[PDB]
Amino acid sequence: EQKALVKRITNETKIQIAISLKGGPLAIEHSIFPEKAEQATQSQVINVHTGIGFLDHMIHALAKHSGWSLIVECIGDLHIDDHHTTEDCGIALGQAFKEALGAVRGVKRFGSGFAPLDEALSRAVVDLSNRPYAVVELGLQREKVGDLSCEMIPHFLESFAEASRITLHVDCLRGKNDHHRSESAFKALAVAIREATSPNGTNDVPSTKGVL
Amino acid sequence: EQKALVKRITNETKIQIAISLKGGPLAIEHSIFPEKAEQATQSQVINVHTGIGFLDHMIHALAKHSGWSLIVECIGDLHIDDHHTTEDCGIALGQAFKEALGAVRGVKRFGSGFAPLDEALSRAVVDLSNRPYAVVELGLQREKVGDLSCEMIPHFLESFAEASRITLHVDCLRGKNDHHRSESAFKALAVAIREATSPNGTNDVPSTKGVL
Amino acid sequence: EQKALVKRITNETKIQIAISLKGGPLAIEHSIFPEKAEQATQSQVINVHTGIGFLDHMIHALAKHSGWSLIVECIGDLHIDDHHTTEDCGIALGQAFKEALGAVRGVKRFGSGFAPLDEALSRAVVDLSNRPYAVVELGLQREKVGDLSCEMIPHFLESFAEASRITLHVDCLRGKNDHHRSESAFKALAVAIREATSPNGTNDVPSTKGVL
Amino acid sequence: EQKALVKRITNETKIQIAISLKGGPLAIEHSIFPEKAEQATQSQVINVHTGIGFLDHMIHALAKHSGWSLIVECIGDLHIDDHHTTEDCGIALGQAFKEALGAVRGVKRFGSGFAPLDEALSRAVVDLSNRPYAVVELGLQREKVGDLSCEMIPHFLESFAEASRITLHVDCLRGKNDHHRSESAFKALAVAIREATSPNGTNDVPSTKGVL
Amino acid sequence: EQKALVKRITNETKIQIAISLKGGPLAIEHSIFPEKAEQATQSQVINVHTGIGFLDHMIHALAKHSGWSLIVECIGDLHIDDHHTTEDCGIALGQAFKEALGAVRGVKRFGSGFAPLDEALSRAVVDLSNRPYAVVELGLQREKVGDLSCEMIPHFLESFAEASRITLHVDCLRGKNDHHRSESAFKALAVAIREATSPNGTNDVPSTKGVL
Amino acid sequence: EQKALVKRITNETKIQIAISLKGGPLAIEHSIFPEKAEQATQSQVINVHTGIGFLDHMIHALAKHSGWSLIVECIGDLHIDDHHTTEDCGIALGQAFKEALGAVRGVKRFGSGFAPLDEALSRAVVDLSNRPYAVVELGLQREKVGDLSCEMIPHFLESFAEASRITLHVDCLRGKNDHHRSESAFKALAVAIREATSPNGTNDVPSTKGVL
């Protein structure tokens, strides 16, 4: 039902993102890697292959705790820094989430998610209203985690909310380990998207202005 | 099932509030306006007519995201300021919510709701315990929004929790637009009341002292 | 050549914006006002009719110093405050500017405009790159100007850059009259859009990634 | 289904804790008190008998709003202070919660609970991941409540998360009555455990590393 | 006598740790590296092979000054950062130390160790009491040492005390070289474990509550 | 017309820079790489090959928005840090710009360029007067971007203005992403050089002292 595939091709990166919000299986009929963080345990299949290993782990923890099936492919330039291949892999990952739920009606529209990870604590609220907005206040006192440049972790969530047309407030409340502090943000966003995209029932677009 | 009508008549305002917490249709057999923010889309009907237009919009966003059907009619004095017609239209709107749920049993009793609106972020918790309390910390750096006097927006929620016999903590966490900051508070309260008045199941009054 | 008409219809406002970036004449074949800030001096015709008079004057000064022909018709709710009829009349005014220039190629792409107005000084830079962004730092120490609520003046430029897919930095450098301070911002944006949408020549999309 | 009994016997205290997470009835076939806060209203039976009366009331409010059936029997030394009989009655109460849910799979894994009590406001998040952690920031400006020594209230929740192998962040946001401030923390933890131990469905261990 | 082998297998790392607290020789009958910091000088054999070279050097200096024989084999994911292969190689290294001394009786139970390294000075106290605790206050003003991410150095000792069920206070008193500051912490812990696990004599469990 | 080739050969780096300020095609008759950021779209050809990938991207964005055709070949020592191959490389790129415009007459002589990039804002002014000067105030709170050492980004523009005999003030006004903050500086310099080297007309050396 809620499936989409997005092939975003620019002169910096080549993207192919297939998503399924309700879970289940996924494949790719024609991949972009030559010769055709991976969890495939019979309910959801999530297999992310970007050039950045720590940014694979954040999309993986996002889709594991959202109930998503998600295949991410990215052939990006890594002789240059990791900005152009994290910003572009967040724009196309917001578009795949946007096309997978067309009609915003019959949903809760408001998800809030707290998630801890071992003294770090992050909340994420999400709004699903067609104006994009992103208030990402991860206070990270590190310059690079393993390959992510640690200022792209807010910039990923900035472009995710931008291209998915959602309003997003992610704020890490405490923590002093920045693997812990950044993974808890993606685990908190996974709780909020799961709560906002939910069967409200009664089949009504949840807005005053009637347009979502 | 959960319906109530409250006709509050004083020498300052005349009120008639009909509410339905489970949604559905509503009408008035004998209105107070002469010759007999309006959403009527087949699941819930919410039609608020106070003399204040911005206070219409806050009760509307409250009832739209609560699943309520709600008709509000307030004939109040507006040659004087808007205090006497916002305080009185919040006392009677807490009484209509109170009479619509008589027995507080089989409910979650604890609703917490975060709701953003475009860089503003408000949380609201609600308690449904028969002592009234209201801790409303909307930090509004404006004097009037469109017709509300912007200090009545906490005073509305003060008298709502007062006359509905609930404990309420509404706190705007961030934001620098006070339409955004005050509407997100009413959208957050709508999530919390929806979560506290919920089918817990097992038919038990959720209290240590056994009285709610 | 560079003309567009946008009819944005929601349950709060009804909009009809016809724009011509190269100037010249404009009309409307079927208007939204019943029975069919106005400058019509033989080179460009600019006629803005919103319910807010001071927001008419800011779109007028924007289109007068941009070389635009622009007709704006907004039927919005004014018994509620002026947010819903200024935000919506900025989203549709960014969409009309976006559809009027389809191919961003052969343009300067970078406009910077300083404009004074009688001790106020505002600069505006504009980027014409398909990610929207808005950094609007008008320091206004007023609550309402004549009918605008003076926090909507940054919120107008926020939604203009949002729906037009441009990056925008507007910053008032000095000034202590907020009519002067806000009009100089719209006069500075008019210089920047005029400078960014300009005949660069040589017919090339001005980007590293080749996509604009 | 989710039942466990823990008999923890040391030279300071003797403990016997029988728990049922899904509610229902409970008894003890051979008690530790001589000759064989009590709620027994036909859905859940919660009967706590420690030597500390205020620590009875906090385990009672924890199990009342969690849906638990819980019998606590602690024979501890009270001629010495109340540390050794509150720390030990929290270690065994985390072990009884741990043995009552063996397989952490098919659960939400992330519960967040806000709960007010009459100007006090506490949130509690819980993680159900097999590393124990406890960040308890109840700001209590009292030395003893009725018999608890008011620094054991964080030390109880420290040893509860320690022996139950969960990660826990309990933080009182406001309040100036420390009965209110400490009871709202246990009422907030009751919402979070109820939300984390919940039927997620689809029968999958919710972790990246696959081990919970 | 005091030997243990721990094979910890998760979907992130595969661990095999063989320890001997009294020294002597050690081998592995079936290793995890393909085709079958190393000191093997006739009294103790210590051979650590993790993917991190600086974390090899800290376990090596820990076991060299403890009298241990210790073989560490960790096959961990290093395309992601080094957190998951340092946290997991500290949990299994606390479990191997825990299983190597079963009965905590006849031991000093309290080891304190100061160790300098060239203007750095660290103390470490250790408690061997079955509640785990870790207060690690290495003040490191570096982000990465050679491959360790320099916030994992406290996180290693956190999970070591966690899984070994010991209470641990490691605090660097001075120093301005963070190789020196972190190696002196592991050399100080080696003095403390050597002092706590020591032949007290008289064969008695050293506790008031009689249970260790 | 405005073409130059500079082959700078030292014992640290070997450079070959061919430039064309008016655009058009460029080739190299005898390259320095064995066996003979690249944009070649029919108007200008820009192909930079230094050992640093992020410094390729900054010369590329400089020449893309200047109208330049530019081939850069730098064979530099990278077992040592990147200073000697970014400085050396900046000196020869100022000399190639200097030899490409011999007679400074008939030009505007004063270019100012603002350029944003996604909350970063940089201005650059340029003077084309034969005393070199460089006031570069990029406030970068990072140590390395991808391969550039992030203090060489001002040191590149220092040596560019030094060897090109121009006066240069580059100042980033805001921004909190240092890829954004440093790329906007090179995009702002591209606007300023384009504006200073411009057909003023009337064929006069624009100076009081008559010598440029």
Ligand SMILES: O=P(O)(O)C[C@H](O)Cn1cncn1
């Ligand atoms: O958020 P909505 O669309 O449900 C109705 C809002 O009132 C529209 N809005 C946009 N800014 C402030 N309000």
Ligand SMILES: O=P(O)(O)C[C@H](O)Cn1cncn1
């Ligand atoms: O809130 P309840 O009624 O469930 C039981 C409370 O303990 C009563 N109370 C009122 N103030 C402090 N406690």
Ligand SMILES: O=P(O)(O)C[C@H](O)Cn1cncn1
């Ligand atoms: O701005 P562009 O598209 O010309 C190339 C940029 O490098 C892309 N980008 C986006 N963020 C940082 N860089």
Ligand SMILES: O=P(O)(O)C[C@H](O)Cn1cncn1
């Ligand atoms: O929390 P998990 O087990 O779901 C996967 C985590 O990434 C493991 N971890 C432990 N510290 C940081 N991460």
Ligand SMILES: O=P(O)(O)C[C@H](O)Cn1cncn1
């Ligand atoms: O540490 P022990 O077990 O020797 C006896 C302690 O008194 C127990 N305890 C735990 N917290 C405070 N005391």
Ligand SMILES: O=P(O)(O)C[C@H](O)Cn1cncn1
């Ligand atoms: O800048 P010029 O050469 O046009 C004339 C200047 O006055 C020369 N100068 C150099 N320092 C101060 N003035």
Ligand SMILES: [Mn+2]
């Ligand atoms: Mn970017």
Ligand SMILES: [Mn+2]
């Ligand atoms: Mn992780």
Ligand SMILES: [Mn+2]
């Ligand atoms: Mn009042």
Ligand SMILES: [Mn+2]
């Ligand atoms: Mn509104």
Ligand SMILES: [Mn+2]
């Ligand atoms: Mn708005």
Ligand SMILES: [Mn+2]
């Ligand atoms: Mn004016």
Ligand SMILES: [Mn+2]
């Ligand atoms: Mn204790």
Ligand SMILES: [Mn+2]
């Ligand atoms: Mn109480």
Ligand SMILES: [Mn+2]
């Ligand atoms: Mn960890």
Ligand SMILES: [Mn+2]
């Ligand atoms: Mn060393």
